[PDB]
């Protein structure tokens, strides 16, 4: 699993 | 799984 | 597992 | 980018 | 980027 | 890069 918080 | 939260 | 917190 | 070759 | 050759 | 050879 990926991912991005931004 | 992928996910980009922006 | 990946994750960025940004 | 991602690949398997099997 | 992720590769697999099997 | 990740590369698996098998």
């Known amino acids: 699993n ?4 931004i």
């Open 2 to 5: 990926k991912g991005a918080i």
